C-alpha cells in the first residue's frame, strides 16, 4: 500500500548548408596561431564581411624546395599561372576557374579565416588521389550478406602508425599515375606496383575541393575518387589482390572492413565512402 500511494503523491505534485567546417576549424593544426572567426553567414567571399582580418600563416617548410615558394607570395614570385599549369604545378581546380586575388588564389568555397601559405605546398588547388576498392561480404555458404534491407560490403583500409585514424590508401599525386604509388609507397609491391597501376583503371566517383584542416584562403585541396570493385569473391583478380601481399615495407596494418557510419577512419574519407556505398545501394 505504501509504495502504491507514493506514486499518487508523485503524480499529483508533478502535474545548415554545405560548409568547410574542417577549414573554418579553429586552431590550425600544429601552427600555434588561430584563424579568424568566420560564421556560417559570412563564410563566402560574396557576403558582406568587412571586419575580416586573416593573419598570414606560412609554415617554414611550406615555401621550400620543390614546393611553392609562395609562403610570402605577396612578392612577384607568385607569378605562376592560375587555373593553368605553370610547369610542375597544374594549378587548376576541378571545381573550375578559380579567381585570382593579387597573384594569390582565393578558396573557391569561401573565406577560411586564415591567410598565408599554411601546410599546403602549392597554392590554389592541390590534387591527389584516393582510390577505392570494394568487395561484397559473403557468408559461409557463398551468399552475400545483407543489412536490415540493404547489403554489406567489405573495403580494405591501411593503418598508419602515427595517425590515430585508419586512412584510405590515398597518396599525394606527385607523379601522374603513381599517385597510389604514393598511397602504396610501401604497400603493394615493387614491380606489381605497375601491375596494380594497370589495375588502377576503374570507375570514378567524385572530384573537387573537400573540407580539411589545412586550407587557407589561398591553397585548397582536391583529389580523385576512382572505384575498383570486387563484384564476385572468388576470382583471380582478388587472388591477385591477395598476391599483392608485399605490404611489409612501411605499413602499420592492412585489413578489410565493412561499411559502417562509425567505421574508424579519417574524417572526410568517410563521406567519400558514403558516396561509394550510395553508388551501389548498400547500407549505412
Amino acid at each position: 500500500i505504501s509504495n502504491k500511494v507514493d506514486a499518487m503523491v508523485d503524480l499529483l505534485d508533478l502535474d545548415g548548408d554545405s560548409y568547410h567546417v574542417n577549414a573554418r576549424h579553429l586552431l590550425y593544426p600544429n601552427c600555434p596561431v588561430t584563424r579568424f572567426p568566420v560564421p556560417n553567414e559570412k563564410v563566402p567571399w560574396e557576403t558582406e564581411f568587412l571586419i575580416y582580418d586573416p593573419p598570414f600563416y606560412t609554415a617554414e617548410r611550406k615555401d621550400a624546395a620543390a614546393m611553392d615558394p609562395m609562403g610570402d607570395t605577396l612578392e612577384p614570385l607568385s607569378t605562376i599561372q592560375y587555373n593553368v599549369v605553370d610547369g610542375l604545378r597544374d594549378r587548376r581546380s576541378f571545381h573550375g576557374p578559380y579567381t585570382v586575388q593579387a597573384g594569390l588564389p582565393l578558396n573557391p568555397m569561401g573565406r577560411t579565416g586564415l591567410r598565408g601559405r599554411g601546410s599546403l605546398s602549392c597554392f590554389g588547388p592541390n590534387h591527389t588521389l584516393y582510390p577505392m576498392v570494394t568487395r561484397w561480404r559473403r557468408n559461409e555458404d557463398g551468399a552475400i550478406c545483407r543489412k536490415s534491407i540493404k547489403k554489406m560490403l567489405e573495403v580494405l583500409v591501411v593503418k598508419l602508425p602515427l595517425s590515430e585514424h585508419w586512412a584510405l590508401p590515398g597518396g599525394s599525386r606527385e607523379p601522374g599515375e603513381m599517385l597510389p604509388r604514393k598511397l602504396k609507397r610501401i604497400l603493394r609491391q615493387e614491380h606489381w606496383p605497375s601491375f596494380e597501376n594497370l589495375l588502377k583503371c576503374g570507375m570514378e566517383v567524385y572530384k573537387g575541393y573537400m573540407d580539411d584542416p589545412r586550407n587557407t584562403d589561398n591553397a585548397w585541396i582536391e583529389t580523385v575518387a576512382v572505384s575498383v570493385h570486387f563484384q564476385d569473391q572468388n576470382d583471380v583478380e582478388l587472388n591477385r589482390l591477395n598476391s599483392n601481399l608485399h605490404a611489409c615495407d612501411s605499413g602499420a596494418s592492412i585489413r578489410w572492413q565493412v561499411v559502417d557510419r562509425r567505421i574508424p577512419l579519417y574524417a572526410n574519407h568517410k563521406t567519400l565512402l558514403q558516396k561509394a556505398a550510395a553508388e551501389f545501394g548498400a547500407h549505412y
Binding site: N139, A143, C145, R146, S148
Partner: protein, 476 residues
C-alpha cells in the same frame, strides 16, 4: 512414442522432383539446379534424369513426387532454452483432416474454444510503447483464459516474431500451466536456413537447431518462441507462397468441427486479427470477411491497418480514389508511387466493399474510446458476429449464452446477454444450468439464481439421474 514415430511416415508425404533438367537462369553459383535446385547437379534427389522424358519445362505435375517424409519429430532450439517443440514437414496436397487428427490425437491437443489466426507484414518494424504493451497483454491473456489455439507463420521476422516475443514474455512469467499458451507455426519448408539438420528418417526426437540472424540470404530462419511448427513444401527451394492454399483449407476445416461439453454442443468460432501488413494482407482480409469469419484491426502502426482505421468512420461511397491516392502516398512514402493506376481503383473497390459489411469488422481506437482491453474487444467482436448471423426465433440468445459459458468468463453474459431485449423465461435455461453444474462453475449458478431459476422447479428426477451419471471420474 514409436506409434506416432511410425504413424507419420505411414501417413504423410514430402515432395521432391524426379525430372532433372537444369534450370534456365543460374542462381548464386547455384548453376546445379533443375529449375528448383535443392541439392544436386540438378533439382534431383534420385537418379538425376529427365524421368525417361526429354520433355522440357516438365511441370511439378511432370517433375515432383510425394513420398513418406524423413523430416518429422521433436526439436529443441539449441543454445536458446530448455523447452522442446514439435515440428513436422508436410506436402502441399494433403487433407486438412489428417493434420487435425495428428494434432489432437498424436500430439495430445484438446479441441480449443477459439482460433486466433493472426496476420501482418513480414517486414520488421515497431510501434508506440503503450499500444504494444496493451496489445501483448490482452492477446496472451485472452488466448489463455479461453484455451485458444493461435495460428500464424513462423519465421523470425515481422509480427510473427513480435507475438513470439509476447508469448515468450508470458512464459517468462508462466505463473502456472506454462504450456497453456500454445502457438503453432505455419511456414514454407522451401524457405528454411539450416533445415538439413533434421532431415533424418525414423524420427529425430532430440533435434538440435542452430540459428543465425542475418546469417542467411533470401531463405529465412524460424522464430524461437512458437510451440509447434508445421512445414509445408512443394518441392522447391527459393520460392514463396506454398503455405496459404493449405492454411485456408485448415482453419476452415476447424471452423466446422463441434465441441460438446456438459450438455451443450457448439461449433468452434474463429476470428482473425491483423497488424501493419500490406497489400497482400488486404487481399486476405477481404477474402476472409466475405466468409463470415470476422476481423479486428488495431488503430495504430499499420500501413494497410491505420488507413482502414481512418476510413472506419467514413460512410460508404464517400471514398474517392483520390482520397485513397494521397492516403497511400502519405502512408507508404517509399512505395507510395510505384502503384499503377490499374490497381488503385482495385483498392478503392476492395476497401469500399470491406467497410460496407458494417458488422463483421471492428476498429480498435487505441486509448480514446472503448479501449478497455484487447480481450473484451475480441469477445464483443466475435460475439456481435455470431449474433448478426441469420436465425429464426431467439435461440440465438441461447447461442450467445452457450458460448459465453463455454469460455469460462462470465462478465460478458452478465454484462450484455442478460441486459434486456430478450424477455426470456427462466424455464429456458435448464440445459445451460445443467452444463453449468457438471462443469463446476459456481458463478453462473449464482447468476441464473439472480435471474430466478427455481431449484425446486428445476432439479427434477430425470435431470437428477443425469447429474449422477457424470460425476468427476476421479472421485472415490
Amino acid at each position: 512414442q514409436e506409434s506416432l514415430s511410425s504413424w507419420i511416415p505411414e501417413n504423410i508425404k514430402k515432395k521432391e522432383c524426379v525430372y532433372f533438367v537444369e534450370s534456365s537462369k543460374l542462381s548464386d553459383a547455384g548453376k546445379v539446379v533443375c529449375q528448383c535446385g535443392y541439392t544436386h547437379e540438378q533439382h534431383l534427389e534420385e537418379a538425376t534424369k529427365p524421368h525417361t522424358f526429354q520433355g522440357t519445362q516438365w511441370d511439378p505435375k511432370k517433375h515432383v513426387q510425394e513420398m513418406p517424409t524423413d523430416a518429422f519429430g521433436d526439436i529443441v532450439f539449441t543454445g536458446l532454452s530448455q523447452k522442446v517443440k514439435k515440428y513436422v514437414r508436410v506436402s502441399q496436397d494433403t487433407p486438412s483432416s489428417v493434420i487435425y487428427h495428428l494434432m489432437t490425437q498424436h500430439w495430445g491437443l484438446d479441441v480449443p474454444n477459439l482460433l486466433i489466426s493472426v496476420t501482418g507484414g513480414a517486414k520488421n518494424f515497431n510501434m508506440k510503447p503503450r499500444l504494444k504493451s496493451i496489445f501483448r497483454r490482452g492477446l496472451v491473456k485472452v488466448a489463455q483464459t479461453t484455451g485458444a489455439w493461435i495460428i500464424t507463420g513462423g519465421s523470425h521476422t515481422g509480427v510473427m516474431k513480435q507475438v513470439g516475443e509476447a508469448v515468450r514474455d508470458f512464459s517468462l512469467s508462466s505463473s502456472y500451466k506454462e504450456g497453456e499458451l500454445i502457438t503453432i507455426g505455419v511456414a514454407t519448408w522451401g524457405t528454411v536456413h539450416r533445415r538439413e539438420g533434421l532431415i533424418h528418417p525414423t524420427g529425430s526426437f532430440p533435434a538440435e537447431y542452430i540459428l543465425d540472424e542475418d546469417g542467411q540470404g533470401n531463405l529465412t530462419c524460424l522464430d524461437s518462441n512458437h510451440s509447434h511448427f508445421i512445414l509445408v513444401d512443394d518441392g522447391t527451394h527459393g520460392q514463396y507462397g506454398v503455405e496459404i492454399p493449405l492454411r485456408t483449407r485448415l482453419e476452415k476445416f476447424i471452423s466446422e468441427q463441434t465441441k460438446e461439453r456438459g450438455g451443450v454442443a457448439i461449433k468452434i468460432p474463429i476470428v482473425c486479427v491483423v497488424l501493419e501488413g500490406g497489400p497482400g494482407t488486404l487481399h486476405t482480409i477481404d477474402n476472409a470477411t466475405t466468409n463470415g469469419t470476422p476481423c479486428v484491426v488495431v488503430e495504430g502502426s499499420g500501413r494497410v491497418a491505420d488507413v482502414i482505421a481512418q476510413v472506419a468512420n467514413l460512410p460508404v461511397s464517400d471514398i474517392t480514389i483520390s482520397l485513397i491516392q494521397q492516403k497511400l502516398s502519405v502512408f507508404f512514402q517509399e512505395m507510395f508511387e510505384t502503384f499503377t493506376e490499374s490497381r488503385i481503383v482495385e483498392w478503392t473497390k476492395k476497401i469500399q466493399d470491406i467497410v460496407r459489411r458494417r458488422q463483421l469488422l471492428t476498429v480498435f481506437r487505441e486509448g480514446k474510446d472503448g479501449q478497455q482491453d484487447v480481450d473484451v474487444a475480441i469477445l464483443q467482436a466475435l460475439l456481435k458476429a455470431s449474433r448478426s448471423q441469420d436465425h429464426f426465433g431467439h435461440e440465438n440468445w441461447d447461442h450467445q449464452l452457450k458460448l459465453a459459458v463455454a469460455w469460462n468468463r462470465v462478465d460478458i453474459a452478465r454484462s450484455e446477454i442478460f441486459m434486456d431485449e430478450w424477455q426470456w423465461k427462466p424455464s429456458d435455461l435448464h440445459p445451460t444450468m445443467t452444463a453449468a453444474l457438471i462443469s463446476n462453475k459456481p458463478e453462473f449458478v449464482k447468476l441464473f439464481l439472480e435471474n430466478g431459476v427455481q431449484l425446486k422447479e428445476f432439479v427434477t428426477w430425470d435431470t437428477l439421474l443425469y447429474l449422477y451419471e457424470n460425476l468427476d471420474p476421479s472421485c472415490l
